[PDB]
Amino acid sequence: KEMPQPKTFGELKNLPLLNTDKPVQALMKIADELGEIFKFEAPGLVTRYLSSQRLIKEACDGSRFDKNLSQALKFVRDIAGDGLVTSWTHEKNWKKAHNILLPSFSQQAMKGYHAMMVDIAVQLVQKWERLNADEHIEVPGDMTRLTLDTIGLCGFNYRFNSFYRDQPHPFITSMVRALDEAMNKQQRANPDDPACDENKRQFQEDIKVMNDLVDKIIADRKASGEQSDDLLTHMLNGKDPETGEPLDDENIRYQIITFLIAGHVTTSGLLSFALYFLVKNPYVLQKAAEEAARVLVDPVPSYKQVKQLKYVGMVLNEALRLWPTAPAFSLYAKEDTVLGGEYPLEKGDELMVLIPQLHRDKTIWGDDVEEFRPERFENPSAIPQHAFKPFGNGQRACIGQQFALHEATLVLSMMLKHFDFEDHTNYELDIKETLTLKPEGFVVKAKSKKIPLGG
Amino acid sequence: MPQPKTFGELKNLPLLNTDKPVQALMKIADELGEIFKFEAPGLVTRYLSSQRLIKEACDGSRFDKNLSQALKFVRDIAGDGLVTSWTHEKNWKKAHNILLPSFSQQAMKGYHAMMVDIAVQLVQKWERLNADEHIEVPGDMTRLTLDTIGLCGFNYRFNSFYRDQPHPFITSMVRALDEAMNKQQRANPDDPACDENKRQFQEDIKVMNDLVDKIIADRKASGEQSDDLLTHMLNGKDPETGEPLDDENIRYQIITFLIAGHVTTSGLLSFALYFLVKNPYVLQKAAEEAARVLVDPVPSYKQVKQLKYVGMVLNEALRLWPTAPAFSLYAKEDTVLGGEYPLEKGDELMVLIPQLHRDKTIWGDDVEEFRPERFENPSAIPQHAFKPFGNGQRACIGQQFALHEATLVLSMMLKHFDFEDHTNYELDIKETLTLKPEGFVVKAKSKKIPLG
Ligand code: HEM
Ligand code: HEM
Ligand SMILES: [Cl-]
Ligand SMILES: [Cl-]
Ligand SMILES: [Cl-]
Ligand SMILES: [Cl-]
Ligand SMILES: [Cl-]
Ligand SMILES: [Cl-]
Ligand SMILES: [Cl-]
Ligand SMILES: [Cl-]
Ligand SMILES: [Cl-]
Ligand SMILES: [Cl-]
Ligand SMILES: [Cl-]
Questions:
Q1: Topology of the domain covering B1-452
Q2: Of B25, B74, B68, B15, whose CA–CA distance to B48 is shortest?
Q3: Residue B367 C-alpha to ligand 13 middle, in angstroms?
Q4: What is the distance between the alpha carbons of residues A39 and A170, in angstroms, rounded to a whole number?
Q5: Nearest of B370, B418, B368, B144 to residue B272 by alpha carbon
Q6: Distance separating alpha carbons of residues A435 and A258, to the nearest angstrom
Q7: Distance, CA of A291 to CA of A298 (rounded, Å)
C-alpha cells in the first residue's frame, strides 16, 4: 500500500506543519485524518508515525527494530550526553550504565527509597495544610517541587528544598529553557544559520546552570561521611559485570543530569494530569479517596500499604493512557523488512510511536477512548501486548517505571486522604509541550480533612 | 560542472552560514576555479569568476539582469525601483528614461558646489579634532555620502555631521539590509520564532519611509526652485509613453537612491583610504597630485577631472573590493556558456566581482597588490575584465556621480591631512550585501591649509 502523508511545502516537505508550540497534539490530529500510519518528511528527516496497536506490536519486536534517537533526543544529547536516555543501544556506555544502575530499581532498592519519598510527600501535604482561606494550589509547580526533591533525595542524598522556594528551582528554569530550545530547534531546517548564535549561547548558559548543580551534588557526596547505597553510590562505585569497568567521570556527570531530568519531569506531569482527571470526574475521585482512607490507616504510609492501593494505580495508568507524559519514542529497522504486511522498510528506516494515538486505538479500548475510567485497568492481564506503552519498549524501556508509579501512588493517595479538592476555576485543559506534556495553568483549591501526619 | 560540498537536502546552503558569505564564496572560487554550481532549498545558480566566462554572461543579447535572492528580499524595501525591478518591468525603463538626465555632464556640473559643501564639512570636522582623538572612517564616509545624495538629489540636509551617532535612517537601513542578507540562510522563514525579525524589519522600513515622507513634504512646501533628481521623479514624463512615475514608484525611487546613492560610495572611500595608509608610497603620489591640482581654496569641477592618479586609486580599490560585490543574470534562451556548459532558458548566473578582479590571465600574478598604475592606460584593459558598476543597460546609473564625489573628497582629504594607521588596523570586511572595512580608524594630522 502507498503510505499516507500530510501536506507538503516544496523542499521543506512536512516541516511547516510543526511550526507550532504543540507539535505532538498537531501530530495526533494528522493521525486522526490519515490513520494508523503516515510518512513525515523534513529536510534531513524521514520518519513514519504509527498509531495502531496492530502496527506498533511489530515495531516493538526487538529482533527487528532498535531504539532510535529522534532529532529531539539528538539535541538533548547536548545536555545529557551518552546517558541512558540519549545513548544508542550499541554505544558502550548504554549497556554498561544499564547493568551498573539497574540494581538501584530493584524491590529492595524501592523499599529503601520509601521513607525518603514519604519525607517529601509530607512536605507537600504540609504546604497545602498551611494555606489560608481562598488561597489555591498551582498544581504542576507543586508536583515539580515534589518530584525533583524526591529524585534528589532518593537518588543523590541531596536536598533541593524546592518547598522552601516561592518560585521554581533555578535548575528547573534552565532545564525548561534548554529542552524548549531542543523542541524549537527541530523546526530550524538550517540550525547553523548565523542568526541562531544567541539561542546557542543561551542554550549553553542553561546547560551550565544544570551542571553547576551536578557539581554541587558530586562535591557533597565526596565530602559526606554517610553510608549511602543510592543511585549515585552505584554510579561512583558500581562495576559492569561484563567488562569489570566503572563509569568514567564524564559519563557519571551525564547520568546525574539524565536522572535529575528524567527522574522527575514526566512524573510531575502524570500527577498533574491524574489530579486533573480526578477533579473532572468526582465519582472517580471519591472512589480513589475511599481506597486511600481504607488502606492508609497510619499517620504515614508504609511500603506494603502503597502496594495495596490498587485503584489509585488504575487512576495513574488511565491518566497515562490519555496523556502519556513522554508521548513518543523512535525506532529504526535493523534489517530490510515489511511492516503490517503492507509497508516495505529498508534497513535504517525510522518509526515514531505516537503513544497518545496508540492509547486511543478503538479496536483495543472500545468506542469511549476519550473518556476517563480507571476501570479499564481492572484486569491488566486482559490488555493486549503493546497496547499500553507509556514507559517505552524492550530493553530500552523506562528504568524508572516502578520508581515513578510508587512515588505517584504514594503522593496521590496521601493527597486524597488528607484533602477534598475543588476545580474552582472550571479549568480548561491546556497541554504545554516541552518534549514532555503537562496541564499548564492547572489550579485547584484544597479543603483539609484535618487528619494529622507523623514521621 | 564543479560544485562544492553538499549537506543532504540542504545542498550547499550550510557553506554560507557565515557573516561574510561573499568572502566564503571567493574561497570556494579559489578551490574550484572559474565556475561552480551552488544549490540550496529553492535555489540554483552558477558563480562565475573568470573574464573568459563573464564576458559571455555580459552579452545582453543572451543574458538579462536577474534578481538574486538577495535583491528579491530588498524588493520588500525598494519595491520596483531601478535597482530591484526586472528589466521587463514597465517601471524600470520608464524610470530609467526619466531619471537618466539627472546624471548628465550638465547635471554633474550643478551637483559640484553641493558636493563641496558636504566635503568641506568633513574636512572641518577632522580639522577640529583634539590631539588625543581619532577618526572612525566608515562612519564619517557615511555621514558625507548620505548627506551628498540628500542635498544633490533631493535638496535636503540630513546634517549627519551635527550628529555624534549614525543617522537613524542609517541604523534602520543597515538593520533592514542585514535582515535581507540573513534571510538567504533562513530556510523555514514562517516559523513563529521569526515573528520578531519580521516586526523589526517592518519597523526599520517605516523609519526609512518616514524620511521619505519628510523629503516629499519639504519639496512640496519649498518656495525655492530645484532641478534635481526629485524634480525629475515628480515632473519627468516618459518620452516613450508621455506619463510620469506614479506616487508608489516615486517613493521606491527615493528609497532606492538614498541607499544606492551613498552606501557603496562610503565603502569605496573607506577602502581607498585603507589601501593608501597600507601603501604609503601610493598615498604620497596621490597626495602630491592633489596638492598639484587643487590650487584653489576649494576644488572646481574642472580640477576634479584632472585628478587622474586619485581616479586610478579609486579604480584599484574597486578592483580589490568592489563594494557591490555581485550581480546576477539569467539566460534569455537555451544557450551554451564557454563552449561546455549548456544552460536552459531562465538559468541563473552570479558574477563574483572580487574574483573576476583577481583573474591572473588579465591582471598578472600580483593580483593581491594595490597598484593604481594598473589603470594608467584604461584602453588596454580587456572588455568585461573590470565590472564594479555592473553591466549593460542595467549598469550603475550613478557611476559618474560616485566617482566624482569620491575623487573630490579623497583629494581634499589628502590635500589637507597626513594620515596615520595608528592601530595597525587589520582588515575586517563586514558584509551587509555591500562591503566595508569595519572598525577602520586613523589619526589625521592637519597640514593647516585654509579652506574657502
Ligand atoms: C510517569 C513517569 C515516566 C514516564 C511516562 C516515562 C517514560 C519513559 C519512556 C517512554 C522511555 C523510553 C524512551 C525512548 O524509548 O526513547 C523512558 C526511558 C527512560 N526513563 Fe522514564 N519515564 C517516567 C519516569 C522515569 C523515572 C522516575 C526515571 C528515573 C528515576 C526515569 C528514567 C528513565 C531512563 C534512565 C530511561 C532510559 C532507559 C534506557 O534506555 O536504558 N523515567 N521513560
Ligand atoms: C562606488 C560606488 C557604487 C558602486 C560600486 C555601484 C555599483 C552598482 C552595481 C554593481 C550595479 C548593478 C546591480 C545589478 O546588476 O544588480 C548598480 C546599479 C545601480 N546603481 Fe550603483 N554603484 C555605486 C554608486 C551609485 C550611486 C552614487 C548611485 C546614485 C546616485 C547609484 C545608483 C544605482 C542605481 C539606480 C542602479 C540601478 C540602475 C538600473 O538598473 O537601472 N549607484 N550599481
Ligand atoms: Cl531554518
Ligand atoms: Cl556513597
Ligand atoms: Cl475527563
Ligand atoms: Cl516492553
Ligand atoms: Cl528489546
Ligand atoms: Cl503550569
Ligand atoms: Cl510591469
Ligand atoms: Cl594592501
Ligand atoms: Cl607602499
Ligand atoms: Cl544590456
Ligand atoms: Cl565601521
A1: Cytochrome p450 (1.10.630)
A2: B25
A3: 26
A4: 39
A5: B370
A6: 15
A7: 14
SS3 content of chain B, % helix, strand, coil (to 5): 55, 10, 35
End-to-end CA distance of chain A: 62
Domain boundaries in chain B? Answer: 1-452
Residues 6+ apart with CB under 8 A from B366: none
Instruction: Give B-chain residues touching A19 at CB under 8 angstroms.
Output: 188, 190-192
Residues of B taking part in catalysis: 264, 389, 396
Task: Say yes or no for a CB contact (<8 Å) between B182 and A194.
Answer: yes
Provide the shortest C-alpha distance from residue A41 to chain B (in Å). 11
> Resolution of this entry in Å?
2.2
Cell of B291: 596638492
Structural contact between residues A203 and B27, judged by C-beta atoms closer than 8 angstroms: no
| Experimental approach | X-ray
Chain B residues whose CB is inside 8 A of the A188 CB are 187-188, 191, 193
**For residue B156, what is its C-alpha cell?**
535636503
Interface test with B, best of A193, A196, A197, A202 (most B CBs within 10 A): A193
Assign 3-class secondary structure to B213-279.
HHHHHHHHHCCCCCCCHHHHHHHCECCCCCCECCHHHHHHHHHHHHHHCCHHHHHHHHHHHHHHHHC
DSSP string, B325-346: -EEEEEESSSEEETTTEEE-TT
* DSSP three-state, residue B286: helix
Place of cell 504546604: A127
Grid coordinates belonging to B131: 590631539
Binary contact (B14, A192; C-beta < 8 A): yes
**For testing the chain B interface, which of A8, A9, A11 should be mutated: the one with the most B CBs within 10 Å?**
A11
Domain A1-455 class, CATH top level: mainly alpha
Name the one residue in this structure whose C-alpha cell is 496541564.
A439
